[PDB]
Amino acid sequence: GLXRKXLCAXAKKKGKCKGAXKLXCKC
């Protein structure tokens, strides 16, 4: 199922959701 800190580590590592807490874990 959905690992929240899995989702955050999605945001950081596709790299299409990088920058600010705004873009961070769940974009």
Residue with tokens 């596709």: 14
CA distance 26 to 2: 12
**Which method, experimentally, gave rise to this model?**
NMR
CA distances from 26 to 1, 8, 13, 19 (A): 15, 7, 12, 12
Residue 4 parent element (H or E):
helix 4-14
CA distances from 27 to 4, 5 (A): 13, 13
As given in the structure block, the two tokens for residue 27 are 């974009």
* Cβ atoms of residues 9 and 3 within 8 Å: yes
